[PDB]
Amino acid sequence: ARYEWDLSLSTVVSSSSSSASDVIGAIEFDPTDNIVATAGISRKIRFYGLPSLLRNNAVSGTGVSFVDQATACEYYICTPAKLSSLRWRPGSGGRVIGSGDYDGVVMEYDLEKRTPVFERDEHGGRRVWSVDYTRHGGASTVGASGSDDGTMQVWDPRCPPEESVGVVRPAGICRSAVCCVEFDPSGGPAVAVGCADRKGYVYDIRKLVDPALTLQGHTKTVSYVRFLDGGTVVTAGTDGCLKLWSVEDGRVIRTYEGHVNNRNFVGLSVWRNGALFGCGSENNRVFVYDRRWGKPVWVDGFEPVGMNSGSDKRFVSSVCWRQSGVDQCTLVAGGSDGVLQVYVGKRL
Amino acid sequence: PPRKVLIISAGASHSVALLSGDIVCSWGRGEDGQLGHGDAEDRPSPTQLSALDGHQIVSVTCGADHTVAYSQSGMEVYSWGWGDFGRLGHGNSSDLFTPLPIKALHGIRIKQIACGDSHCLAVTMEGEVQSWGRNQNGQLGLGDTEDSLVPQKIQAFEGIRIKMVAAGAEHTAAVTEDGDLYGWGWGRYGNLGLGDRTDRLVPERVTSTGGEKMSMVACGWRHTISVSYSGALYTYGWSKYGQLGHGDLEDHLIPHKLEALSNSFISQISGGARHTMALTSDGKLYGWGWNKFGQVGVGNNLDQCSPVQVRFPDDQKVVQVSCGWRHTLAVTERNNVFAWGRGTNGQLGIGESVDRNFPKIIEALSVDGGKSWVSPAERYAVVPDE
């Protein structure tokens, strides 16, 4: 087990102002990695210019920089429903961001006009847990949503929203929820889903009728699936573990344990260039694993001022790496209280 | 003998009713606290809101994910549900899962409460208006865009007795006792009736009303409905879903009379997010607009750009109607309650999680056939378990 990264808390974004619940359920970078969008229970998609956020609020030495929400947030979009998920739409030049919500609705917003441009309600009103888009498709991009109704649905955002390019029900008879959907980030044909039947599945987006690859070993719902590369995917389960899988044969390569996750979505993000897996934890911790070892290489336990009070046990509810990092990495974590924690890392 | 249903109100995903003996009941989505039972559970059937028993509640009103009730005898206003932007009026932004009194309104003579999606207004017996909650587009009428966590008087109405108000997603409208019509808040899609696309931070009189005095008003996400002393019905704003009801999908920046209903005298109106209901003097219910979930009640799921009569067993007359975001409720002359539209969270009150496109009787209400806070980790971002 090698400890190769100096990964340290740089910035904390918090609100003095609002007592509203503000669990962060989704954190995503735009295609340039200049913008971070967050969303969750508070029906607000918030945007942050991350380099400028850190540059304009820097402190001396190794201290942590504390920034108020009103200072940190460039702007936000009020939405009709609680958000489960966010994804920027490729091929739109960072102009369009998609969301899934607790009304079962997929929305797309144009950020140049701040207006909704796409609205799809085809999951019977069952919650949408996850949204994604195919990569390197250009004009052929398609979106997909996974929902409590037990389907992953594939739709063309240029067509009328009532239409569908495909629909799969991975869990079969019991129709268990599809909790996560993820397209191959390098543009291959694989699309991975995680389901409440405790399994992951890998389909061929070009031909959804072809038999899925089944990822079987979790003992609880698969809450997340993320690609490491064209040949491997990482799942998270509410059995308290992550698992690395071969896409070629479906075997478990490695299981990762040490964090606490038996109930909530706590986030999973895979930094593909560094082969590092980040996730939240229900004991208010951020965990990072290296692909090579099943024990965490790094944990952080930041506690915002005044957390102790209140009987609500704060947890880390979302994480997201900056994918374009190679010699530097950036990990953004979101708390169940709406606090953002920005970690920056360089090699030791 | 079932209690008479006195008041029905529909929210974004929930429904509330007031019955004789001042009994409040609530059903539908409960995850945000909007049912007021002290838990975050949905309720598929009308469920008595026990915390308000004996409080002499005389009125209930749904916002989107919040609810307000008031007692004229107790001189107390109560609110609960989702609390962001101060829409509950308690001086903070906290969620509530049980009713709490709005202290600022204690001892005030309240004649009406209107609940927009994220703001509220109270009209007093003396015709004054206080507002609170979200104000980003000026919908509180206070002359700024700062949200207000407590009720504040609209100073622009001093000397102007207000008959009633209505609130949409981000705009507000009002009618005076003299018959003047007003609009303010978000005006991008013409729903203020002022002839331009500009928001208004204070009430602005609609100068082009066809020369008629307006008796009632109601609001949706991007449209507004008004009814004249003559009983003529006017709609204005966006009509992408046909919610204006004029036979086309054209915008209207000023009140436009709905000619197909000139035959009838409109006695009540209600605005959904994107659909519309009008009740005639005869008890005929007409609906139009967004119908994807069947919330127009005319037996299909195609949008309706012109009024269509909603049909009830034995053509019993309707005496009350209330639109939510995606469903509709109605009370008939036979003391029956009907619901239709989206029912995923049980808001139709018929023990289901299904949509319906024609009226369905709520058997629990018809003659014919606990904690203030719930931790977010128990009700949001919970991984489906099995």
Short mmCIF file of N, CA and C in Angstrom, two decimals, chain A residues 18-21 23 25 39-44 76 78 80 82-84 102-103 115-116 119 121-122 124-127 129 148 174 176-177 179 196-198 220-221 223 238 263-265 312 315, chain B residues 13 29 31-32 65 82-85 92-95 134 136 147 149 170 189 221-222 241 274 290 292-293 325-326 342 344-345 353 355 373-386:
data_model
loop_
_atom_site.label_atom_id
_atom_site.label_comp_id
_atom_site.label_asym_id
_atom_site.label_seq_id
_atom_site.Cartn_x
_atom_site.Cartn_y
_atom_site.Cartn_z
N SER A 18 -29.07 30.51 5.66
CA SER A 18 -30.31 29.77 5.46
C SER A 18 -30.31 28.49 6.28
N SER A 19 -31.41 28.26 6.98
CA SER A 19 -31.64 27.05 7.76
C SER A 19 -32.35 25.96 6.97
N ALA A 20 -32.62 26.19 5.70
CA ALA A 20 -33.30 25.17 4.91
C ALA A 20 -32.39 23.96 4.77
N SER A 21 -33.00 22.77 4.68
CA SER A 21 -32.24 21.57 4.37
C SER A 21 -31.53 21.77 3.04
N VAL A 23 -29.06 19.04 1.65
CA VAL A 23 -28.29 17.86 1.26
C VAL A 23 -27.88 17.98 -0.20
N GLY A 25 -26.98 16.16 -3.40
CA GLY A 25 -27.08 14.84 -3.99
C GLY A 25 -26.29 14.68 -5.27
N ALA A 39 -26.43 20.09 -6.82
CA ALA A 39 -27.89 20.09 -6.67
C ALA A 39 -28.29 19.07 -5.63
N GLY A 40 -29.48 19.28 -5.06
CA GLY A 40 -30.02 18.30 -4.13
C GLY A 40 -31.43 18.61 -3.66
N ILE A 41 -31.64 18.44 -2.35
CA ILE A 41 -32.98 18.54 -1.79
C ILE A 41 -33.55 19.94 -1.89
N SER A 42 -32.71 20.96 -2.04
CA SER A 42 -33.19 22.33 -1.93
C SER A 42 -33.68 22.91 -3.25
N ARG A 43 -33.79 22.09 -4.31
CA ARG A 43 -34.42 22.52 -5.58
C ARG A 43 -33.66 23.70 -6.20
N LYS A 44 -32.34 23.70 -6.06
CA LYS A 44 -31.51 24.75 -6.63
C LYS A 44 -30.30 24.11 -7.28
N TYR A 76 -27.60 30.47 -9.61
CA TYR A 76 -28.30 29.21 -9.42
C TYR A 76 -29.64 29.26 -10.14
N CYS A 78 -33.57 27.85 -9.93
CA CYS A 78 -34.60 27.24 -9.08
C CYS A 78 -35.39 26.22 -9.90
N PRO A 80 -38.49 22.95 -10.06
CA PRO A 80 -39.76 22.59 -9.40
C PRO A 80 -39.64 21.41 -8.45
N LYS A 82 -37.07 18.35 -6.11
CA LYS A 82 -35.80 17.93 -5.54
C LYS A 82 -34.98 17.19 -6.59
N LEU A 83 -33.70 17.51 -6.65
CA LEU A 83 -32.81 16.96 -7.66
C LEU A 83 -32.12 15.70 -7.13
N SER A 84 -32.05 14.68 -7.99
CA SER A 84 -31.24 13.50 -7.71
C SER A 84 -29.90 13.51 -8.44
N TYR A 102 -37.02 14.18 -8.29
CA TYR A 102 -37.92 13.37 -7.49
C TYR A 102 -39.36 13.37 -8.01
N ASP A 103 -39.68 14.14 -9.04
CA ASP A 103 -40.97 14.00 -9.71
C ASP A 103 -40.92 13.02 -10.88
N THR A 115 -32.95 29.36 -19.32
CA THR A 115 -34.29 28.85 -19.58
C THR A 115 -34.29 27.33 -19.71
N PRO A 116 -35.38 26.66 -19.36
CA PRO A 116 -35.49 25.23 -19.68
C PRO A 116 -35.69 25.03 -21.17
N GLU A 119 -37.92 18.90 -21.47
CA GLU A 119 -38.70 18.45 -20.32
C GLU A 119 -39.32 17.10 -20.66
N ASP A 121 -41.13 13.54 -19.08
CA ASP A 121 -41.84 12.96 -17.94
C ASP A 121 -42.42 11.63 -18.42
N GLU A 122 -41.60 10.58 -18.42
CA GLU A 122 -41.99 9.30 -19.01
C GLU A 122 -41.69 8.12 -18.09
N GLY A 124 -43.57 7.56 -15.33
CA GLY A 124 -44.77 7.38 -14.54
C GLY A 124 -44.78 8.17 -13.25
N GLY A 125 -43.98 9.22 -13.15
CA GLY A 125 -43.86 9.96 -11.92
C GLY A 125 -42.98 9.32 -10.87
N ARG A 126 -42.37 8.17 -11.16
CA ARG A 126 -41.41 7.54 -10.25
C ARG A 126 -40.08 8.26 -10.32
N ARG A 127 -39.43 8.41 -9.15
CA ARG A 127 -38.21 9.20 -9.05
C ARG A 127 -37.18 8.78 -10.09
N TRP A 129 -33.32 8.57 -10.57
CA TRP A 129 -32.12 8.56 -9.73
C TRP A 129 -30.90 9.06 -10.45
N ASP A 148 -36.92 4.75 -10.33
CA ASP A 148 -37.66 3.85 -9.45
C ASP A 148 -38.65 2.96 -10.20
N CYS A 174 -39.03 -8.61 -10.76
CA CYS A 174 -39.27 -7.73 -9.63
C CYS A 174 -39.21 -6.26 -9.99
N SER A 176 -36.84 -4.04 -10.05
CA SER A 176 -36.14 -3.24 -9.05
C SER A 176 -35.63 -1.93 -9.66
N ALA A 177 -35.52 -0.91 -8.80
CA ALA A 177 -35.10 0.42 -9.24
C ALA A 177 -33.74 0.39 -9.92
N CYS A 179 -30.80 2.62 -10.05
CA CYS A 179 -30.29 3.70 -9.23
C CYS A 179 -29.17 4.47 -9.89
N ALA A 196 -31.44 -1.98 -7.74
CA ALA A 196 -31.82 -2.43 -6.41
C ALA A 196 -32.05 -3.93 -6.32
N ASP A 197 -31.78 -4.70 -7.38
CA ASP A 197 -31.72 -6.14 -7.21
C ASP A 197 -30.32 -6.61 -6.79
N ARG A 198 -29.46 -5.68 -6.37
CA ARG A 198 -28.08 -5.91 -5.88
C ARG A 198 -27.10 -6.21 -7.00
N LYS A 220 -26.25 -5.86 -1.33
CA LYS A 220 -27.28 -4.83 -1.22
C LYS A 220 -27.33 -4.05 -2.53
N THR A 221 -28.28 -3.12 -2.62
CA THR A 221 -28.49 -2.31 -3.81
C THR A 221 -27.19 -1.67 -4.30
N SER A 223 -25.78 1.38 -5.69
CA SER A 223 -26.19 2.78 -5.73
C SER A 223 -25.46 3.60 -6.80
N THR A 238 -24.80 -0.35 -0.88
CA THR A 238 -25.11 -0.08 0.52
C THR A 238 -24.83 -1.29 1.41
N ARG A 263 -27.24 3.04 4.16
CA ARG A 263 -28.57 3.60 3.93
C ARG A 263 -28.54 4.57 2.75
N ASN A 264 -27.75 5.63 2.82
CA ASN A 264 -27.93 6.77 1.93
C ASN A 264 -27.02 6.69 0.70
N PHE A 265 -27.41 7.42 -0.35
CA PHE A 265 -26.47 7.73 -1.43
C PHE A 265 -25.38 8.63 -0.86
N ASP A 312 -28.88 15.72 14.24
CA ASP A 312 -28.72 15.26 12.86
C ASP A 312 -27.26 14.87 12.63
N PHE A 315 -23.40 13.72 7.19
CA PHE A 315 -22.60 12.79 6.40
C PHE A 315 -22.18 13.48 5.10
N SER B 13 -48.18 18.14 -5.12
CA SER B 13 -48.41 16.70 -5.09
C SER B 13 -49.27 16.27 -3.91
N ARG B 29 -48.50 13.39 -1.29
CA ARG B 29 -47.08 13.38 -0.95
C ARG B 29 -46.84 13.99 0.42
N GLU B 31 -43.41 13.74 1.89
CA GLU B 31 -41.97 13.69 2.17
C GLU B 31 -41.40 15.04 2.56
N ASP B 32 -42.11 16.13 2.28
CA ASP B 32 -41.63 17.48 2.60
C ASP B 32 -42.31 18.06 3.82
N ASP B 65 -45.34 22.79 -2.12
CA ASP B 65 -44.96 21.78 -1.13
C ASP B 65 -45.13 22.32 0.29
N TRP B 82 -42.39 22.44 3.23
CA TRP B 82 -41.10 22.93 2.77
C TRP B 82 -40.98 24.43 3.05
N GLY B 83 -39.83 24.84 3.59
CA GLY B 83 -39.74 26.19 4.12
C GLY B 83 -38.73 27.10 3.45
N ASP B 84 -38.15 26.70 2.32
CA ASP B 84 -37.12 27.54 1.73
C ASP B 84 -37.68 28.88 1.29
N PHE B 85 -36.84 29.91 1.38
CA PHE B 85 -37.15 31.29 1.03
C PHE B 85 -38.14 31.96 1.98
N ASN B 92 -37.47 32.23 9.40
CA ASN B 92 -36.34 31.38 9.03
C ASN B 92 -36.73 30.64 7.76
N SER B 93 -35.90 29.68 7.36
CA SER B 93 -36.18 28.88 6.17
C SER B 93 -36.34 27.40 6.49
N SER B 94 -36.73 27.07 7.72
CA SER B 94 -36.76 25.68 8.15
C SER B 94 -38.04 24.96 7.71
N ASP B 95 -37.87 23.70 7.29
CA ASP B 95 -38.95 22.74 7.07
C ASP B 95 -39.78 22.55 8.34
N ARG B 134 -40.54 33.90 -1.30
CA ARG B 134 -39.67 34.20 -2.44
C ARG B 134 -40.09 35.49 -3.12
N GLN B 136 -37.75 36.92 -5.84
CA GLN B 136 -36.70 37.19 -6.83
C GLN B 136 -37.24 37.96 -8.03
N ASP B 147 -36.01 38.27 -0.59
CA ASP B 147 -37.00 37.39 0.04
C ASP B 147 -37.34 37.92 1.43
N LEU B 149 -38.70 36.57 5.15
CA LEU B 149 -38.97 35.40 5.98
C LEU B 149 -40.15 35.60 6.93
N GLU B 170 -44.33 32.43 -9.81
CA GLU B 170 -43.49 33.56 -9.43
C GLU B 170 -44.17 34.89 -9.67
N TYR B 189 -43.71 35.98 -19.62
CA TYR B 189 -44.62 35.38 -20.59
C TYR B 189 -45.99 36.05 -20.61
N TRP B 221 -48.53 28.71 -13.55
CA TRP B 221 -47.09 28.94 -13.70
C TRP B 221 -46.81 30.11 -14.64
N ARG B 222 -47.54 30.20 -15.75
CA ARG B 222 -47.30 31.23 -16.75
C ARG B 222 -48.61 31.80 -17.29
N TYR B 241 -49.49 24.99 -23.71
CA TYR B 241 -50.29 23.82 -23.41
C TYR B 241 -51.78 24.08 -23.57
N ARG B 274 -50.43 24.34 -15.36
CA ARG B 274 -50.59 24.54 -16.79
C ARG B 274 -51.99 24.19 -17.28
N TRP B 290 -53.14 21.79 -20.05
CA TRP B 290 -52.29 20.61 -19.94
C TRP B 290 -53.10 19.40 -19.48
N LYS B 292 -51.57 15.96 -19.93
CA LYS B 292 -50.70 14.80 -20.05
C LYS B 292 -51.03 13.74 -19.00
N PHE B 293 -51.42 14.17 -17.79
CA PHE B 293 -51.74 13.23 -16.72
C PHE B 293 -53.24 13.05 -16.54
N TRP B 325 -50.79 21.19 -9.24
CA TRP B 325 -49.86 21.24 -10.36
C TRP B 325 -50.29 20.31 -11.48
N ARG B 326 -50.67 19.07 -11.11
CA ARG B 326 -50.91 18.00 -12.07
C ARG B 326 -52.17 17.21 -11.77
N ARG B 342 -52.69 13.27 -12.07
CA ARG B 342 -51.58 12.46 -11.58
C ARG B 342 -51.84 12.01 -10.14
N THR B 344 -49.49 9.63 -8.43
CA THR B 344 -48.34 8.80 -8.09
C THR B 344 -48.09 8.75 -6.59
N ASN B 345 -48.32 9.86 -5.89
CA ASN B 345 -48.08 9.94 -4.45
C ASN B 345 -49.35 9.75 -3.64
N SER B 353 -51.73 4.75 -6.56
CA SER B 353 -50.55 5.46 -7.01
C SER B 353 -50.56 5.60 -8.53
N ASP B 355 -52.42 7.37 -12.24
CA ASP B 355 -53.08 8.54 -12.83
C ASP B 355 -54.48 8.16 -13.33
N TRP B 373 -39.97 17.90 13.19
CA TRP B 373 -38.81 17.83 12.32
C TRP B 373 -38.48 16.37 12.02
N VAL B 374 -38.14 16.08 10.77
CA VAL B 374 -37.72 14.75 10.33
C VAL B 374 -36.36 14.90 9.66
N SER B 375 -35.38 14.14 10.12
CA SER B 375 -34.02 14.35 9.63
C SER B 375 -33.97 14.08 8.13
N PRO B 376 -33.32 14.95 7.36
CA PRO B 376 -33.30 14.76 5.90
C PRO B 376 -32.75 13.41 5.46
N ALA B 377 -31.86 12.79 6.25
CA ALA B 377 -31.27 11.52 5.85
C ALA B 377 -32.27 10.38 5.83
N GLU B 378 -33.43 10.56 6.49
CA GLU B 378 -34.49 9.56 6.47
C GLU B 378 -35.46 9.76 5.32
N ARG B 379 -35.40 10.88 4.61
CA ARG B 379 -36.43 11.21 3.64
C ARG B 379 -35.87 11.71 2.31
N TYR B 380 -34.55 11.85 2.19
CA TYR B 380 -33.92 12.27 0.95
C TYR B 380 -32.64 11.46 0.77
N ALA B 381 -32.31 11.13 -0.49
CA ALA B 381 -31.09 10.37 -0.80
C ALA B 381 -31.05 9.05 -0.04
N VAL B 382 -32.20 8.39 0.06
CA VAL B 382 -32.29 7.07 0.65
C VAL B 382 -32.19 6.05 -0.48
N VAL B 383 -31.22 5.15 -0.39
CA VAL B 383 -31.05 4.18 -1.47
C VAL B 383 -32.21 3.18 -1.43
N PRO B 384 -32.91 2.96 -2.53
CA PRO B 384 -33.97 1.93 -2.56
C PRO B 384 -33.45 0.62 -2.01
N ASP B 385 -34.21 0.03 -1.10
CA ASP B 385 -33.72 -1.11 -0.33
C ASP B 385 -34.53 -2.33 -0.69
N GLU B 386 -33.86 -3.27 -1.33
CA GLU B 386 -34.24 -4.66 -1.45
C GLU B 386 -33.13 -5.22 -2.33
#
